[PDB]
Amino acid sequence: MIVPVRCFSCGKVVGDKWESYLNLLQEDELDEGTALSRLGLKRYCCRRMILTHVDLIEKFLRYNPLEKRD
């Protein structure tokens, strides 16, 4: 499920930063805290938004709405 566009608490916008955040994690091999602070996420609620996100859109995408089995 694609990243929330806005922060549920302070109204800020975090939706656009997900793509750039993923870059710092393996291209620059940085840790999670410094990467989170590199993008201006300073309140811990924005860090909560980005840090604990389960990206489920890459699993539905390998799939079709037609013929799942059980």
């Binding site: 390998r62 799939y63 079709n64 037609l66 013929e67 799942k68 089995r69």
Partner: peptide, 13 residues
């Protein structure tokens, strides 16, 4: 004996 792509094309979880 289904692999991950086999489960996807048959549409398994």
């Amino acid at each position: 004996e289904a692999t991950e792509s086999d489960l996807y094309k048959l549409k398994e979880c």
